[PDB]
Design a protein around this ligand. Sequence first.
Ligand SMILES: *C(=N)[C@H](C[C@@H]1CCNC1=O)NC(=O)[C@@H]1[C@@H]2[C@H](CN1C(=O)[C@@H](NC(=O)C(F)(F)F)C(C)(C)C)C2(C)C
Ligand SMILES: *C(=N)[C@H](C[C@@H]1CCNC1=O)NC(=O)[C@@H]1[C@@H]2[C@H](CN1C(=O)[C@@H](NC(=O)C(F)(F)F)C(C)(C)C)C2(C)C
Lengths: 299, 291
Amino acid sequence: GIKILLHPSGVVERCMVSVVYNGSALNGIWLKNVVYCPRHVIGKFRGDQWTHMVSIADCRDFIVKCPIQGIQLNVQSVKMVGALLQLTVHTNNTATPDYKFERLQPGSSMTIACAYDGIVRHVYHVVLQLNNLIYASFLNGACGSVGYTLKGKTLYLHYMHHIEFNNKTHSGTDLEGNFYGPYVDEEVIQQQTAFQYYTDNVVAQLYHLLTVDARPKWLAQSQISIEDFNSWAANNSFANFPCEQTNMSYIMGLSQTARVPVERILNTIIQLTTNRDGACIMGSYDFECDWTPEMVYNQ
Amino acid sequence: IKILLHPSGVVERCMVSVVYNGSALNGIWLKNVVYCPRHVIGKFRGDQWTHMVSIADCRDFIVKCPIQGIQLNVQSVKMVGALLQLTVHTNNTATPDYKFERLQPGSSMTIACAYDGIVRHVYHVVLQLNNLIYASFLNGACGSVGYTLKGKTLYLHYMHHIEFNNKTHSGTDLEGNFYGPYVDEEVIQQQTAFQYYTDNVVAQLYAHLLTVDARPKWLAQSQISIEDFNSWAANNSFANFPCEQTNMSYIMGLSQTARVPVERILNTIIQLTTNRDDFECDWTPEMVYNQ
Ligand SMILES: *C(=N)[C@H](C[C@@H]1CCNC1=O)NC(=O)[C@@H]1[C@@H]2[C@H](CN1C(=O)[C@@H](NC(=O)C(F)(F)F)C(C)(C)C)C2(C)C
Ligand SMILES: *C(=N)[C@H](C[C@@H]1CCNC1=O)NC(=O)[C@@H]1[C@@H]2[C@H](CN1C(=O)[C@@H](NC(=O)C(F)(F)F)C(C)(C)C)C2(C)C
């Protein structure tokens, strides 16, 4: 079958820690001898107050515990890197994997290890949207939770949570400390660019054809050219196709398996915007960007 | 509101590879017992299993725990249901508090799809009323487990055995008993006709109302009573509502948040019949409401 595949969370569970500072509690990840955590654990500061407040923060006020390894950590140094804190600790984490800090592009997926008090409670799957937000699920204390992928034995850290907006959207930084999109870790009202479907992923969602119904009734009989679709997409909140040229090899492979050219899929998308009438496609009632062409093709 | 899965670390530390005379699959290592599917010893049927198990030399079960870098030695072999219980000399220090809990249809679990004793993927399934799960497995994936977590207690529900022609999958609980009338034999087996788990269909529609679009246009404008729905359900492949009385509290709470009564949802289910002329029961009302 074709499923949403999550990367196993064990390697991340053993590096998670809890970070508590003067009544404020969240999560951090412990790699080598450094704990990375959101900087707002020491207060709800604004603009350019961060550098001074971090320079004033007492290292002994950072209470860091790694619950699975059952040991307490002692912060020797604090250094702000971007919107993250780098608390250098005395002990090296023997569970540290081979890792790399890798920034995600919009339309790519990752597994979220959503933790509380340094303990992973739930894992789930998200895709970075074109507004540079993720549609995740977080409560108080969930900040510091990470989004990641795995390739062999290497852990690819992509994301660390900071903030939730009014419409239950979520924003954070990569592990080098830079936010996705223009959002910041402040309680101010921040503008959001209008939503736009990642067209490659919606196409991968319809390619349902391979697991649910090879010939559904809502699948268009006629084709539309990529170019004619892209003129329509500009006025209907769909990104220009293809969003990534590398997805074309996956999409071409899916088209041969399903025996349905992508031009029919694209024209199905156009018709569905006025014809869907509650149709359920790959188990969802709307267009979803969670299915990437790579995951659907490779599994 | 997301599909929530349970973290796989505790399961990862317990997985092992079981290889027997060229047949390779997975097992789980709890205390001093490795649990694996029995067909690793060969393709037998009916009541052949008992005798064939008792002549299998324990030295032929090559058992490795790749996470801990350990190779285990089987001391004795016991068949419990359709599972082998391989007693090993070493106790697994990573063993958690665990329970063998049987799943009822309509409940969810997390699958730790493994190969060579190493978890490769983690994905979500709901046991359907035909007692099958719609999963994804390749050769050597047998012995993969389905689980949930309540704190740090590992609840084991499923161990994988067989894949049917329509990419349904069947297996046993950890006591060794299959879900439904399916067995570990390479023959055509009749299937329970599909039936929609109505509690989950209701839960998914509420999840859509509470995230994407409250009041879409295909929403039913008028109510239908629970009783009148159940008379329709009996002739239209939908289970009697509610499927679990304990789901009513979740469903009524979701109806209040979305401000749409469940009677309207049930009537929407009916009017959507033409669209159906699958994967509609993957959201349980507990997962939707709690998060
Ligand atoms: C860190 N653990 C939390 C995670 C939040 C809590 C609710 N759901 C989540 O994902 N992050 C925060 O508490 C950050 C933190 C102060 C306020 N904040 C928010 O996420 C707030 N949002 C906003 O102010 C908004 F809307 F502008 F984005 C909150 C109202 C609590 C959701 C700071 C420093 C931004
Ligand atoms: C155990 N590792 C595999 C898991 C399979 C491999 C492909 N996808 C899976 O889920 N299970 C088996 O190899 C079992 C095993 C012999 C045959 N078998 C099957 O799953 C086969 N299916 C059937 O026999 C069917 F469809 F008729 F039910 C197979 C054709 C290989 C998929 C035994 C002893 C049943």
